[PDB]
Design a protein around this ligand. Structure first.
Ligand SMILES: *[C@@H]1O[C@H](CO)[C@@H](O)[C@H](O)[C@H]1NC(C)=O
Ligand SMILES: *[C@@H]1O[C@H](CO)[C@@H](O)[C@H](O)[C@H]1NC(C)=O
Ligand SMILES: *[C@@H]1O[C@H](CO)[C@@H](O)[C@H](O)[C@H]1NC(C)=O
Lengths: 137, 278
C-alpha cells in the first residue's frame, strides 16, 4: 500500500554512488566513485505515511534495488541485506525518512530507534548514534 | 567484476569487488600473488596495491574471499595509461559533480578513501593550481564560495599515498558543474482545498521555491487510490514559485459518494499533508 513510488539515484555525503550488484544468488553493495557518464543504479523508493509527526506526519519508505528485491535491515548484525519475499513487507524493510537540507536524507529503522542506514569502511551498514548522508536523483 | 584505472608513476589501490572482513582471507591472481610486498605489485587483504602502477600491469586481476562457508570471487578489470602532455585530462577519469553558486561549494577528491594520506592536498583546475581566498581546500574536498557559472571545469586533485613510509603520487580528476538556481523547500501546503464540503473538484499544494526532486499532489479515495465506478478519475497540470495541482473528475453522482472521505494529499521529503473534502 505505498502512496507513490519513484526511482532515484543514491549517493553519499562525499558523493560516492551507492551501487548494487546482484550475482542473482548473492549480491554486493558498493559505496564507490563511478566513471563519467557511467549510468547510476536507480532504486525504487516507495513512500508510506508514518504517524510519526512533523511540521503533520512524516513519510517512511522501502527501497527496491531491483525486480522484487528490497532492503532488509539486519538488527543484531548491524547490516543491510537483500531479500526476495513476495510476501507483504516486514518491519525491517521500512525506514522513517528524515530531511535536513535539500535532497539530503537519512533512513531510520522503523523497528529499532536511533539506528540509521549509514556507511562504514566504504560499505553500507547500520549506525547507532554526518555519516548518514544520502542525496537523491 | 569492477573496472579501475590510473596513470603510470602513480600509486593505485584497488578494492576487491566481493566484500568481507579482516580475518576473512583474500587471494589475488593475474595471468598466487604476493601477500605482502613483492615490492611493486602486491595485495594486502581486500586491497590490491600497485606502488607505483605501470601500463604493463593492465589486465584482469581476479580475487577470492574465503570464509570458508563460502568462497566469493570477484574480478578487477584494470588499465594503466601514459600521461600525454595534452595537459587536459581525457574523459576517462572519475565523474561529474554539481553545485550551487555560493549555494554549494564542495568538490570531493575521488577514491581518496582507498589510500593512506595524512596530508593536506593540491587542487588544479585544467592544469592551473588553485590558490588565494575564493578557493579554500579542507580535508578531502575543495570549497569554492565564489562559484559563478565560471567555475565549470575539470578539477583534479593530487595527493600522496604513503606505504611503509614510502611516498607515492596519486591524482584524480572529475568535472564540476554549476547549478543555475538553487531553491529551498518546506513541508507541503495545500492551497485547495481546506477541510471542507462540496455538493469538477480540485487540489493544489505548494512545496517550495526551487525545482523539487520530489513533490507530488495526488488524490486518494477513502484513503486508497483505486476504488472505482467509471468515475472517479484523476488528472494533472503544471504552471520563482513552485506549486503543483491535481484535479478529480466525476460526471455522475451516485449514492455511495456520500460516505467516505475524499482525501487530497501533498507529499515531499519533509512529509505528508492531507486535506479532507465531502
Ligand atoms: C573455497 O572454499 C571451498 C568450499 O568452502 C574449499 O573447500 C576450497 O578449498 C576453496 N577453494 C579452493 C578450490 O581452493
Ligand atoms: C600510512 O601513513 C602513515 C603516516 O603517513 C605511516 O606511518 C603508515 O605506515 C602508513 N600506513 C601503512 C602501513 O600503509
Ligand atoms: C614523503 O616521504 C618522504 C620519505 O621519507 C618523507 O621524508 C616526506 O616527509 C614525506 N612527505 C610528507 C611531508 O609527508
Amino acid at each position: 500500500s505505498p502512496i507513490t513510488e519513484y526511482l532515484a539515484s543514491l549517493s553519499t555525503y562525499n558523493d560516492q554512488s551507492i551501487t548494487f550488484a546482484l550475482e542473482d544468488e548473492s549480491y554486493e553493495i558498493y559505496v564507490e566513485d563511478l566513471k563519467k557518464d557511467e549510468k547510476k543504479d536507480k532504486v525504487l523508493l516507495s513512500y508510506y505515511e508514518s504517524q510519526h509527526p512533523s511540521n503533520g506526519k512524516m513519510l517512511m519508505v522501502t527501497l527496491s534495488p531491483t525486480k522484487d528485491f528490497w532492503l532488509h535491515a539486519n538488527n543484531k548484525e548491524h547490516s543491510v541485506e537483500l531479500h526476495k519475499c513476495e510476501k507483504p513487507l516486514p518491519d525491517q524493510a521500512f525506514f522513517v525518512l528524515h530531511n535536513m537540507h535539500s535532497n539530503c536524507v537519512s533512513f531510520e529503522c522503523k523497528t529499532d530507534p536511533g539506528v540509521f542506514i549509514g556507511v562504514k569502511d566504504n560499505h553500507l551498514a547500520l549506525i547507532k548514534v554526518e555519516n548518514i548522508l544520502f542525496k537523491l536523483s | 567484476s569492477k573496472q579501475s584505472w590510473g596513470l603510470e608513476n602513480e600509486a593505485l589501490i584497488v578494492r576487491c569487488p566481493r566484500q568481507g572482513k579482516p580475518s576473512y582471507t583474500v587471494d589475488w591472481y593475474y595471468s598466487s600473488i604476493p601477500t605482502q610486498e613483492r615490492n611493486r605489485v602486491f595485495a594486502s587483504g581486500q586491497l590490491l596495491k600497485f606502488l607505483p602502477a605501470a601500463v604493463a600491469d593492465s589486465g584482469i586481476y581476479t580475487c577470492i574471499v574465503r570464509s570458508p562457508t563460502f568462497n566469493r570471487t570477484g574480478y578487477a578489470n584494470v588499465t594503466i595509461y601514459k600521461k600525454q602532455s595534452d595537459c587536459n585530462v581525457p574523459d576517462y577519469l572519475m565523474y561529474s559533480t554539481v553545485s550551487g553558486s555560493e549555494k554549494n561549494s564542495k568538490i570531493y577528491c575521488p577514491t581518496i578513501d582507498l589510500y593512506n594520506w595524512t596530508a593536506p592536498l593540491e587542487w588544479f583546475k585544467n592544469c592551473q593550481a588553485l590558490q588565494g581566498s575564493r578557493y579554500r581546500a579542507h580535508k578531502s574536498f575543495l570549497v569554492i564560495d565564489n562559484v559563478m557559472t565560471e567555475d565549470a571545469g575539470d578539477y583534479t586533485c593530487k595527493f600522496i599515498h604513503n606505504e611503509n613510509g614510502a611516498n607515492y603520487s596519486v591524482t584524480a580528476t572529475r568535472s564540476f558543474t554549476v547549478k543555475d538556481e538553487q531553491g529551498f523547500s518546506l513541508f507541503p501546503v495545500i492551497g485547495a482545498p481546506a477541510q471542507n464540503e462540496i455538493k469538477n473538484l480540485t487540489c493544489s499544494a505548494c512545496f517550495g521555491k526551487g525545482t523539487q526532486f520530489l513533490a507530488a499532489v495526488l488524490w486518494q479515495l477513502n484513503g486508497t487510490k483505486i476504488t472505482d465506478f467509471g468515475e472517479p478519475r484523476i488528472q494533472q497540470e503544471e504552471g520563482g514559485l513552485a506549486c503543483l495541482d491535481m484535479v478529480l473528475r466525476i460526471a455522475d453522482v451516485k449514492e455511495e459518494d456520500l460516505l467516505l472521505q475524499y482525501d487530497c494529499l501533498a507529499l515531499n521529503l519533509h512529509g505528508l499533508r492531507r486535506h479532507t473534502v465531502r
